[PDB]
Enzyme design. Sequence first.
Site, PDB file in Angstrom:
ATOM      1  N   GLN A  63     -28.630  33.429  68.050  1.00 26.12           N
ATOM      2  CA  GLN A  63     -28.456  32.407  66.992  1.00 26.12           C
ATOM      3  C   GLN A  63     -28.563  33.050  65.607  1.00 26.12           C
ATOM      4  O   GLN A  63     -27.696  32.753  64.788  1.00 26.12           O
ATOM      5  CB  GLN A  63     -29.450  31.267  67.187  1.00 26.12           C
ATOM      6  CG  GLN A  63     -29.086  30.371  68.362  1.00 26.12           C
ATOM      7  CD  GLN A  63     -27.764  29.700  68.116  1.00 26.12           C
ATOM      8  OE1 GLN A  63     -27.658  28.790  67.294  1.00 26.12           O
ATOM      9  NE2 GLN A  63     -26.734  30.177  68.798  1.00 26.12           N
ATOM     10  N   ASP A  77     -16.871  21.484  62.761  1.00 27.76           N
ATOM     11  CA  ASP A  77     -16.979  21.894  64.177  1.00 27.76           C
ATOM     12  C   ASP A  77     -18.336  22.544  64.405  1.00 27.76           C
ATOM     13  O   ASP A  77     -18.894  22.321  65.472  1.00 27.76           O
ATOM     14  CB  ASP A  77     -15.834  22.824  64.551  1.00 27.76           C
ATOM     15  CG  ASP A  77     -15.598  22.946  66.036  1.00 27.76           C
ATOM     16  OD1 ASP A  77     -16.028  22.060  66.789  1.00 27.76           O
ATOM     17  OD2 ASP A  77     -14.954  23.909  66.417  1.00 27.76           O
ATOM     18  N   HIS A  86     -19.434  15.107  70.890  1.00 28.43           N
ATOM     19  CA  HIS A  86     -19.129  16.191  69.932  1.00 28.43           C
ATOM     20  C   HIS A  86     -17.973  15.753  69.017  1.00 28.43           C
ATOM     21  O   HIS A  86     -18.050  15.985  67.789  1.00 28.43           O
ATOM     22  CB  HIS A  86     -18.862  17.485  70.692  1.00 28.43           C
ATOM     23  CG  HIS A  86     -18.130  18.515  69.900  1.00 28.43           C
ATOM     24  ND1 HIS A  86     -18.722  19.202  68.872  1.00 28.43           N
ATOM     25  CD2 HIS A  86     -16.886  19.020  70.027  1.00 28.43           C
ATOM     26  CE1 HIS A  86     -17.857  20.060  68.386  1.00 28.43           C
ATOM     27  NE2 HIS A  86     -16.737  19.986  69.091  1.00 28.43           N
ATOM     28  N   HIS A 116      -9.858  16.896  68.299  1.00 32.24           N
ATOM     29  CA  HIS A 116      -9.830  18.354  68.126  1.00 32.24           C
ATOM     30  C   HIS A 116     -10.160  19.067  69.433  1.00 32.24           C
ATOM     31  O   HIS A 116      -9.773  20.239  69.549  1.00 32.24           O
ATOM     32  CB  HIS A 116     -10.726  18.762  66.957  1.00 32.24           C
ATOM     33  CG  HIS A 116     -12.132  19.053  67.325  1.00 32.24           C
ATOM     34  ND1 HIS A 116     -13.078  18.068  67.427  1.00 32.24           N
ATOM     35  CD2 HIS A 116     -12.767  20.214  67.577  1.00 32.24           C
ATOM     36  CE1 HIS A 116     -14.233  18.621  67.788  1.00 32.24           C
ATOM     37  NE2 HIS A 116     -14.077  19.930  67.866  1.00 32.24           N
ATOM     38  N   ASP A 117     -10.861  18.454  70.380  1.00 29.91           N
ATOM     39  CA  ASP A 117     -11.281  19.173  71.619  1.00 29.91           C
ATOM     40  C   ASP A 117     -10.872  18.350  72.840  1.00 29.91           C
ATOM     41  O   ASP A 117     -11.390  18.592  73.925  1.00 29.91           O
ATOM     42  CB  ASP A 117     -12.773  19.512  71.611  1.00 29.91           C
ATOM     43  CG  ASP A 117     -13.106  20.855  70.977  1.00 29.91           C
ATOM     44  OD1 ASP A 117     -12.204  21.711  70.947  1.00 29.91           O
ATOM     45  OD2 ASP A 117     -14.264  21.031  70.481  1.00 29.91           O
ATOM     46  N   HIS A 134     -18.735  20.214  74.713  1.00 32.34           N
ATOM     47  CA  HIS A 134     -17.383  19.887  74.188  1.00 32.34           C
ATOM     48  C   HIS A 134     -16.881  18.549  74.725  1.00 32.34           C
ATOM     49  O   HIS A 134     -15.863  18.501  75.361  1.00 32.34           O
ATOM     50  CB  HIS A 134     -16.408  21.006  74.521  1.00 32.34           C
ATOM     51  CG  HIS A 134     -16.661  22.228  73.714  1.00 32.34           C
ATOM     52  ND1 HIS A 134     -17.200  23.368  74.248  1.00 32.34           N
ATOM     53  CD2 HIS A 134     -16.438  22.480  72.408  1.00 32.34           C
ATOM     54  CE1 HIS A 134     -17.268  24.282  73.314  1.00 32.34           C
ATOM     55  NE2 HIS A 134     -16.820  23.756  72.168  1.00 32.34           N
TER      56      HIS A 134
END
Length: 313
Positions: free
Chosen positions: A269, A217, A72, A106-107, A68
């Site tokens: 996953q 994202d 990213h 966004h992060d 993050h």
Amino acid sequence: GLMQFTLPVRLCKEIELFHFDIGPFENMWPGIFVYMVHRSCGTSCFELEKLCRFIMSVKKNYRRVPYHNWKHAVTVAHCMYAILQNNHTLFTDLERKGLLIACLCHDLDHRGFSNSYLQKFDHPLAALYSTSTMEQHHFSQTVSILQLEGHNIFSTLSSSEYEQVLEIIRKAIIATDLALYFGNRKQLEEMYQTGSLNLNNQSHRDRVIGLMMTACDLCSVTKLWPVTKLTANDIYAEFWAEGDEMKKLGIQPIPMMDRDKKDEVPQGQLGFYNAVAIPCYTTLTQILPPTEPLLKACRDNLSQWEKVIRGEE
Ligand SMILES: Cc1nn(-c2ccccn2)c2sc(NC(=O)c3ccccc3)cc12
Ligand SMILES: [Mg+2]
Ligand SMILES: [Zn+2]
């Protein structure tokens, strides 16, 4: 104002593609981003010196965490750029401006811990906002940087447009809370199939931008396999770090976050591709047909995780 950012030949071609990888050179990501705002927006929409001072402050406020991080942020912005470029006519001059800033911010100031961990650690930020804890924090930080001197990149907007664009960014950033995704997609699927999805409805645009933010994202799941594989190590390293902090509180963490349960990564996953990624890009492709490359690459990687469980890699 004749200063057109140009990228070397391979990047200039590769950047238009959903599966573009921004590369290992940190020092080129700001130029990459500006190039995207100019092609995506106008050379006019932002003042270069304000933009460059805004971008550098945003970078300084991303932290050195395994996933993050500032890479990213730029990746998510890039995927948003690609969606917008393949859906030229659907978005206003404000949405295009707001959404690429949303994706970069966004992060903001992410320490590598889920909302869940903030709640059980009893972090102050969890007192201030009970839901979407980190996502209200990220927006709070975006707004802080907007109000530094020389950083108001939206200064040429009316009072009105400025409030619309900050309300686009706020909703955009909140929608990166994945707990919100599940409902948002259930409701969009039911509107598209009963034929009631209407893009003039401000209620329906908000949900659709919310879906694009999820798509952007998750977009490490939509790259070429070797980039998808290698980003997974970074993702799991944050998860495992948090499980470590979970155990430190006297809480057995879920197996995803337990580094003693690495064995179960590829199966985890599968779950995620089946339960989240495939549905996300399925629904997005029904709403926005030119995003189909995201669904294709996502199925390919799902298929590449099946090969890792069957011992063929
Ligand atoms: C097993 C796995 N892989 N993976 C991943 C893979 C590629 C890109 C991004 N993420 C994720 S993200 C996730 N769950 C949440 O983030 C979450 C957050 C709030 C509430 C519920 C779930 C689980 C999971
Ligand atoms: Mg986030
Ligand atoms: Zn993110």
